[PDB]
Amino acid sequence: ATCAMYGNCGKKSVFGNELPCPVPRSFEPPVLSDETSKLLVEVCGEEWKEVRYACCTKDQVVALRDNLQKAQPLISSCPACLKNFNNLFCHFTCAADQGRFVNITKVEKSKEDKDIVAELDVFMNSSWASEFYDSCKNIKFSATNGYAMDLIGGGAKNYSQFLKFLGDAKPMLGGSPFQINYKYDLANEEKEWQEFNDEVYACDDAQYKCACSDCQESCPHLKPLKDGVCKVGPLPCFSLSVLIFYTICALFAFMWYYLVFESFNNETNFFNGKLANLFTKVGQFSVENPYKILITTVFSIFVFSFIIFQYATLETDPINLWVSKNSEKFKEKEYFDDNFGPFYRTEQIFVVNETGPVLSYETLHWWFDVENFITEELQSSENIGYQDLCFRPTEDSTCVIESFTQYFQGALPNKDSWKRELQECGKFPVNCLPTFQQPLKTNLLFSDDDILNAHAFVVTLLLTNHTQSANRWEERLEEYLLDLKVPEGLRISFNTEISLEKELNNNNDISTVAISYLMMFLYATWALRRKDGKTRLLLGISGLLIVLASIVCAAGFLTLFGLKSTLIIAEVIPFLILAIGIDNIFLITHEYDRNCEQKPEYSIDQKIISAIGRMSPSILMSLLCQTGCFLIAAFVTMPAVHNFAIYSTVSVIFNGVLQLTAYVSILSLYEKRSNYKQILKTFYFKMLTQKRLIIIIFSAWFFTSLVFLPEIQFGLDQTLAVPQDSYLVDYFKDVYSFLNVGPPVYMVVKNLDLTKRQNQQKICGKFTTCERDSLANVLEQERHRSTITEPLANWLDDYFMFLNPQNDQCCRLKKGTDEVCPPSFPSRRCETCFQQGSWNYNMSGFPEGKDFMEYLSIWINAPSDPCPLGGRAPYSTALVYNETSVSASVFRTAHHPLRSQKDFIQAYSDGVRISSSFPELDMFAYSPFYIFFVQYQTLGPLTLKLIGSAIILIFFISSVFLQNIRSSFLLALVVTMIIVDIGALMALLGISLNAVSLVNLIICVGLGVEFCVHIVRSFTVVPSETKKDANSRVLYSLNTIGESVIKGITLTKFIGVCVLAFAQSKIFDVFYFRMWFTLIIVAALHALLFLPALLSLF
């Protein structure tokens, strides 16, 4: 054996550790003693048994042994690094070839004048150094909760710097006693010095595995790439698909140019015959008994008026309106609320210094004297302060105030060192535990982590609620904050849960809605004037009281069945009926009016029966089409959409009944007591010669609208939902601006044994032997791609760490018994529950049987003050147990800011995706907002089926009545053009797709068929007098049933809507005006210009 060093030669400094004694290479080391060999192998390993002629003695191994142990806690987390760390120094002093890779440089004289090496040069393989640095790269310290490389390598970033800290001459701070040159440049041809090269280990090594938290290699690297979208190029994939179709499709058509079956099976034929006879009897009975039918209608609007007012009439809460109770997300919310309690009521308050940082001597002193008012002496009318309602982690501990005031224990820190004191707490919240023993992250409290330069702070107050007493407290808080007089240069934007249920029901848009409908009545009376010029006000006024009587009858009839009328019903239902119910007034009146001429059945009562007989079949067929469209939506899942599907289907059926029996009686009565003597629709419509041009223009419009379809965005911005100029406008605009923390995410695990070792390894995140794709590792690796980018609050890891023997303060039991040893008995009789040699980082002595609970109860009740690892404060309400098994548990994770509607839907997908990413765990992710955004997942395919199925109904409900497949297909061809055209202006007009929009898009089909169905039927059931040809019939219908549309639904809904543009609410202006102003212009264009041109070319 050859050694360049051996033995010990005094010390280089008084009152200091001794220094090795350099020796030349000529000498040979003596045989090691028995004691030295046993100690050397124990500290280093079993591989040293073969070698028994090392270059170290008893005095050297003991010194080396002591120095290795002191560094053991730092690197004990990752055994791979620990082995490498000890291997380097073990071969430094005991390698038989010590001088081969260690070259002495200078020698000095010690206190005894012996030989002591001042410095030496050590050479090693570059790859070996990289592996060593890689092994200890990401080791995480326990107490510091941060990278352990800082303490061992001084924050080194490369192996060259890290190794230098090891070899640097630092006699102070327990460092090395001499300088060591870890050079990386040597040649093997010297024949005297060879770079050190021995076994090395890495994190990925199967033998010396390391926890994923301690090394990236161990973490699950599979992580299959997430992809659930179809986009190609700068446009959506469907847009490219449609555009590509036009190019290729046009090629086939261009080359070609350059180069009713219903007679059979007359069962349907007889339908058009008996139906007219049936309505003739209804018309006959409604004209011969006008009083018997009018009294009942007046009686019905009295009995139903009784019900809608007194017997029962109720609205619904925001949760009921939006989310269906059967949705899987809501079923999960009930489980979370039932077990882990409802989520806290959050009352955010923002203090903003627009042009600088809020933190100052004036504001810090001022806010402390206003945050001590809200949380101390703000008794509401019921005389309940915040303390009564505030949320306490446990009864002993005070409640939580997520504000920077909680730093300094809520007391003034004096105007001498506030800047310095606040900075320290933010960096390490553990050492500044608030009065509730819960760490406060700086991201939540402050907008900017700089703290001193932060431009605002968050004063979120969390209430556990006390059964409607909390609801009353926010009233005082809401009033109090508004009345606050903040100093110059500051502003307050706040929020309170009462705001959503209070601010929402505060709009005064009824003024504009009432006026708009008032104008509709005024025009309707003047639009019923006779051909000569007489004005039938009594008929129009009475006719408008029948359409408004159907709403009351339906709105009161359903309240008899327990249905609740949503606030949406107050707008959509009146609009639909005033359109369906106004067309029938003009069609029946004009048909009678045209029956005044031609003197068919001169008798006044006969002129009406003929009028009903001619026009009722189209009215009934349109009614079935509109009933079928809404009835389909009744199969939807959302309750607000489902609610409308039931109201409209009834508000329209009742309208049909009152527009064929009650109104006919009014018409019969009015005309009889009036006895009026019989004294551009053709000039312009003669332009029908431009048939091909109209089809081309309207066909190009449809095709161009088909490529903008996939550009529609989902979601409903809440900022517009509430009335404008509110106190929320400066909050919602500020929650997306100065808030850097997203909603909490609760990874609820259910029915997992969590006692047998096998199950514990699926949640471990800090131990080695646990499964690679555990709950923590998977969620740790998903912090970089998913929207869930905040550390997991793993209680299982904390519980096991609490048992660590090194944490003597945390766990302590009385000797000879399992009784706990609280701080009230500081006598040193108590010892740690787990022995030093039992607990290991590789889950060796961890509880497996009933002992898991024997220590979980001790942990969960730990004070948490003596040491940061405790259970009472952080994880007392996180897990549900019954002394035998953990029924369920929760791992709070939290989202990222989520400051847009697209992000909100994106966040929900991550919860559903991650929830399903674990097939071995009965797990689900709960966040407060998940229930609201459940619909948007299937809102894409859903609206295809609801609208796609409605079109088929139009083609099938109107096929029997028309008995002409060609005319029925065209009717369904123009009804689909309207929605597709309206479906592309939604993207262009900035109207999103949601429940509020989905219902509106359904009544576009219900109202789109209203315009076109009448014209198509008159084109197919023309009287024998007119010629039987495409052009003549089309011209006849527009003269006959075209004026009833231009002066009826078209203008009636266009005169009132135009004035409706002056609505103040942003939600009403977006989803209810920009969509009912587009279906009255798109449908009017498509029914009065496209349809006459299309039918002529049927």
Ligand SMILES: CC(C)CCC[C@@H](C)[C@H]1CC[C@H]2[C@@H]3CC=C4C[C@@H](OC(=O)CCC(=O)O)CC[C@]4(C)[C@H]3CC[C@]12C
């Ligand atoms: C004439 C107009 C004013 C009638 C509108 C009917 C309202 C009763 C509906 C329409 C859209 C609904 C909103 C659509 C979206 C949401 C989801 C959600 O919005 C939020 O701001 C909370 C989001 C979260 O919890 O993170 C809570 C209910 C709310 C505001 C809804 C409350 C009830 C609203 C305002």
Ligand SMILES: CC(C)CCC[C@@H](C)[C@H]1CC[C@H]2[C@@H]3CC=C4C[C@@H](OC(=O)CCC(=O)O)CC[C@]4(C)[C@H]3CC[C@]12C
């Ligand atoms: C069941 C099938 C075989 C019937 C074929 C008849 C078609 C003419 C129907 C079937 C589905 C319908 C579509 C279903 C849904 C929509 C979206 C909707 O427009 C939008 O604003 C987009 C909404 C969205 O889907 O996100 C209304 C028109 C459109 C394209 C419909 C147009 C007419 C379509 C293509």
Ligand SMILES: CC(C)[C@@H](C)/C=C\[C@@H](C)[C@H]1CC[C@H]2C3=CC=C4C[C@@H](O)CC[C@]4(C)[C@H]3CC[C@]12C
């Ligand atoms: C202040 C300490 C706690 C910091 C630096 C962390 C770990 C210490 C204990 C480590 C870091 C580098 C290590 C180190 C470098 C050099 C020497 C000199 C050698 O002849 C004996 C081993 C010894 C002494 C070892 C073991 C102990 C040291 C000094």
Ligand SMILES: *[C@@H]1O[C@H](CO)[C@@H](O[C@@H]2O[C@H](CO)[C@@H](O)[C@H](O)[C@H]2NC(C)=O)[C@H](O)[C@H]1NC(C)=O
């Ligand atoms: C807000 O921060 C600013 C620093 O950017 C504080 O200082 C004054 O800010 C106003 C603008 O609001 C300027 O007009 C003054 O010139 C600034 N003075 C100084 C000395 O910087 C400001 O006081 C802060 N607002 C508070 C504490 O209410």
Ligand SMILES: *[C@@H]1O[C@H](CO)[C@@H](O[C@@H]2O[C@H](CO)[C@@H](O)[C@H](O)[C@H]2NC(C)=O)[C@H](O)[C@H]1NC(C)=O
């Ligand atoms: C504590 O709760 C657990 C979980 O609910 C109970 O264990 C379950 O008991 C049901 C029957 O009630 C079994 O079907 C399950 O297989 C058990 N295990 C799990 C993981 O659910 C346990 O019985 C409860 N302890 C007491 C004393 O009631």
Ligand SMILES: *[C@@H]1O[C@H](CO)[C@@H](O[C@@H]2O[C@H](CO)[C@@H](O)[C@H](O)[C@H]2NC(C)=O)[C@H](O)[C@H]1NC(C)=O
């Ligand atoms: C966890 O690490 C401990 C500490 O090394 C291991 O304990 C030793 O395991 C070997 C396995 O054969 C036994 O021969 C020893 O008697 C055990 N004790 C000691 C002090 O060495 C334990 O095996 C490891 N377990 C796992 C699963 O890795």
